[PDB]
RNA sequence: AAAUCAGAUAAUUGGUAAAUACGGUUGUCUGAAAAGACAAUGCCGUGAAGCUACCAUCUGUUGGAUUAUGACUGAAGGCCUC
RNA sequence: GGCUCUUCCUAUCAUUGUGAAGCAGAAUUCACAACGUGUCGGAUUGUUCACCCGCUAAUAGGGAACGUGAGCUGGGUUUAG
RNA sequence: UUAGUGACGCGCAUGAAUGGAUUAAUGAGAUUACCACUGUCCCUAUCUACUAUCUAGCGAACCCACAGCUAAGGGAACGGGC
RNA sequence: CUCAGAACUGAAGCGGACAAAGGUAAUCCGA
């Protein structure tokens, strides 16, 4: 039982900013600050090409720094926010100023109610649950 | 209408295709047309004391 | 009467996808067939139902709010939206593009035709915007402590469905607030996003496919549609 | 030794060898599938990358991400001037292949195409064609058309680049065969001949939302090392002689080195045939309005603020294509139709263009015009003119 | 529509700066100001052109003959069977 | 031994077209034409191997002086402390 | 996590100045984490000086049976020569 | 010749070149 099955479509170019070993903050509130990131899910690549995610990837990854129930185990979760700069249909180049991730389950359902800061366009589309527990979404 | 962005720095006025987009913890978008812009805003000088800015220009017309 | 399932893709949704008050019907760009059926079919000449994309994106649902006097679209928006917005949209209601950090107007704002729940922090003029352009009485508040009414509280002129962990105190304050009748409960087989799986307004109910007989059951019941 | 870890190798072995290219406008080695189909067309043109603008427009291309909203592309402007037509080509079919049968030439060819000739012009007594001119006989130039008739499978036009009407250095003109596509010989001969001692419009032959192949040099990047060449990866940094070398030229048996594995050498410079560029717009360097939009609704021309760098201003008409194309700016191209018309979305998609940006590309510029930087700054050219 | 590959381009965004471009500034020296020079590029910020990257963008067809296999007609061998 | 790179084998891991089943579907297994293209990111170990964590259409098995030191590297092995 | 640490110890082959057990300061001494850090890496780009380049002048050395394109074959069982 | 106060002023820069320690927790040796 994984994989991103609640994904509701095709998820856009954005370039990707966050290789594998990338340490994002956490926006939810799973309490857990941060997610240490293992793979990313549908990637082949080239010869020692790092595995990596961006805006709205869903990531497998593990807890650092946090409730003690959440470390130690290897979990999934769905990219919000990356520093990476990417670029949308308008030909402007967007970033945050942080890295940031939701924790949430295969079926695209996060483990918690409220998340901190903004979460991206790219995100929504295909993650209506995320989308839901957003406060504003650029 | 050919839509005009507004420079978040400097308040010049941007065309498509042209500059980039910041956005801090609080959810505040700023749009700059020029790298030096965002280095300046990011630096967090303020506009108002830079000479070729339009902050500057409104302060001591 | 009755309620009806629906799929947007593979999800059960809806409630991201649509935005439903009794005056107007938004729905996404990208549809399928079925989906549109599901709608057009109950709601077709009673009122326009939008086709309609928000920053370019399909999630019109969590991203904007109003009732049958007013459209508050976020700042998301791109004039072309609003634009085609304004064009299917019936002169008596009024369309208007808000400035509020906390972009998600759906997730921030529930409305009925009289009472208006809001993110505790929301602006001043977001406020007296939501106030003046729906033409509602407007609380500040948290269903369940949560800051998401929009998406965790569900509300048409009758009656509402609210996150299923509402203490019994909770809902009667709410309940006393906005003058009906409130239940406690889950849609879509089990999930606590009232919000996302759930839209409603007087007449008509769209809801997610995997919604047990039991809930839809409580949802007809609660919403006095029949 | 089964090789470690599998991947693929390092560069197209159909574009070797990689030295430079002796076709310095394009050549194009096929023509489109030739169809009895419609009159006799032209196939190909001649013209000249100006410089590279981007543009917004509205997409109505159905399923796509972008259905109805606004993009913003990158694209490449081509000034294309007016082909002369000078001559008529006949040939025939052999059994080793096709051969030229004759070269029917007109009363009328300008001194810079007999440039062509010659390696300088004003120090030669310019004898070029002299007996074509004073032997000039209609008669016999009929009936060498009447002989292309009766003999040949295909048929060309001698075709005729002015370049004295851009402002470059080279005057010197360009000389191509364009093969002429149409149902019978006899009319593929008829309209050569109609074309001869005339000029033809990029209009005659490309539209718009039509797709374009475009011929032509890459830029030279001279000798190049062989990450550069071909992308190998870098050895480790701590590698005696050096790093950029590739690791192995071969295994031991065979005793010599294979074709294959990469090596220095020359990089730049070679010919390409790109496929299927589309064209967002063919315009015509009278229209001072030929930048703008229905969108717009006010004069632009496509020359950028200051002038499109390292080119100059684009007074003729031009052709701006999606995306970018082969060669420095200034470099002669040839766009050449799809070898089979194209069916697919990309080619179906109409076009609806609502920015062009005239915004000074020698810097980053931020006025569409001089009378904004004027407004702006408050200088009227006007008043002070006045 | 994406991934890996291939071939290119540089509008945009990034990268690069000994254009020593313009500004800032430490120590010294020219009586001072002004203007500079020396500290193998003093140091710092921006920095056009150029080069450059999935860290940027564009582009990557159509027939014929056949294999395995499935069939038509069919004889050796009245019937049978590719 | 690894790194780098190229090419070959087919006792085919995946991809193409098929035959077979104790082939309902889904999945799987046996076989045929067949390498044309692909066959990845890390823990520990000098490692070949092995074992685990993962993504993946797949994470096939091999050759080329047990491919490849005037290509590196020098952890292992095998001088002198 | 064949790594590090703490424990257990049917110690191949621990053990008492052939010293056993400890141990602050201490170390260009062996090992493991972690924090900061970063071009080690993903993934490679760009800039400077000196070279390699070309020129005037000057001007060696290693090595050298005979020589120098391969496929197979046989052959002192991997030929350049047959 | 040392030390301390207050105020004003700059793109919040100011040991501006030069000069000039990266930390922490463990294990083994040898004081
Ligand atoms: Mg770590
Ligand atoms: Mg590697
Ligand atoms: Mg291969
Ligand atoms: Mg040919
Ligand atoms: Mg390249
Ligand atoms: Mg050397
Ligand atoms: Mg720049
Ligand atoms: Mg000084
Ligand atoms: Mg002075
Ligand atoms: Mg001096
Ligand atoms: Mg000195
Ligand atoms: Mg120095
Ligand atoms: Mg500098
Ligand atoms: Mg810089
Ligand atoms: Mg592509
Ligand atoms: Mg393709
Ligand atoms: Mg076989
Ligand atoms: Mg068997
Ligand atoms: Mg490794
Ligand atoms: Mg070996
Ligand atoms: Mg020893
Ligand atoms: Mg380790
Ligand atoms: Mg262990
Ligand atoms: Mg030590
Ligand atoms: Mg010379
Ligand atoms: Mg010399
Ligand atoms: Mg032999
Ligand atoms: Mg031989
Ligand atoms: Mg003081
Ligand atoms: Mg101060
Ligand atoms: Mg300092
Ligand atoms: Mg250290
Ligand atoms: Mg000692």
Known sequence: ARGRGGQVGTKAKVSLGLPVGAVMNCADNSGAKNLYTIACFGIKGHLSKLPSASIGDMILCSVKKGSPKLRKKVLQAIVIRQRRPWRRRDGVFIYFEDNAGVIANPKGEMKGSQITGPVAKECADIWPKVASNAGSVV | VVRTGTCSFCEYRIYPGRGQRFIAKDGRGFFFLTKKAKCLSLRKVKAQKITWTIARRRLWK | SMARRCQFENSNDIGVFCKLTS???????????????????????????????????????????????????????????????????????????????????????????????????????????????????????????????????????????????????????????????????????????????????????????????????????????? | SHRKFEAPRHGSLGFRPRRRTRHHRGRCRSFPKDDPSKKPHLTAFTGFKAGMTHILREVDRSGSRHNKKEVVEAV????????????????????????????????????????????????????????????????????????????????????????????????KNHILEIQVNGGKVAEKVAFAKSLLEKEVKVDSIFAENEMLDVLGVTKGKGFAGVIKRFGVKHLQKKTHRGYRKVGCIGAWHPSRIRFTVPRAGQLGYHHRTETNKKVYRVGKGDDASNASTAGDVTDKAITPLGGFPHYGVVKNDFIMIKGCCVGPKKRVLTLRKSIIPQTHGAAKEIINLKFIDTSSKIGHGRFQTVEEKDKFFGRDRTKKVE
């Open chain 4, 76 to 171: 490449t402007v081509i000034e294309c001037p007016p082909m002369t037509i000078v001559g008529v080509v006949g040939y025939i079919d052999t059994p080793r292949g096709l051969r030229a049968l004759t070269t029917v030439w007109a009363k009328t060819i300008d001194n810079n195409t007999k440039k062509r000739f010659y390696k300088n012009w004003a120090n030669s007594n310019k004898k070029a064609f002299t007996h074509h001119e004073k032997n000039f006989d209609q008669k016999a130039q009929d009936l060498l058309l009447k002989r292309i008739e009766k003999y040949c499978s295909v048929v060309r036009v001698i075709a005729h680049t002015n370049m004295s009407k851009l402002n470059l250095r080279q005057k």
């Open chain 3, 23 to 226: 005056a107007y019907c938004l729905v996404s760009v990208g549809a399928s067939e079925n989906f549109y059926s599901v709608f057009e079919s109950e709601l077709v000449p009673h009122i326009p139902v939008i086709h309609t994309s928000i920053g370019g994106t399909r999630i019109v649902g969590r991203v904007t709010c109003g009732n049958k006097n007013g459209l508050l679209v976020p700042n998301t928006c791109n004039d072309n939206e609003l634009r085609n917005i304004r064009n299917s949209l019936p002169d008596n209601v009024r369309v208007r593009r808000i400035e509020e950090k906390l972009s998600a107007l759906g997730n921030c704002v529930v409305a009925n035709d009289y009472v208006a729940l809001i993110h505790p922090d929301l602006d001043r003029e977001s406020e007296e915007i939501i106030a003046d352009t729906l033409g509602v009485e407007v609380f500040r508040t948290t269903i369940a402590n949560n800051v998401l009414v929009g998406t965790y509280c569900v509300i048409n002129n009758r009656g509402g469905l609210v996150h299923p962990l509402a203490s019994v105190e909770e809902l009667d304050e709410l309940a006393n607030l906005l003058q009906i009748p409130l239940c406690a409960g889950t849609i879509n087989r089990g999930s606590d996003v009232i919000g996302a799986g759930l839209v409603v307004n007087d007449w008509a109910a769209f809801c997610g496919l995997d919604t047990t007989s039991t809930e839809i059951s409580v949802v007809e019941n609660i919403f006095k549609l029949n």
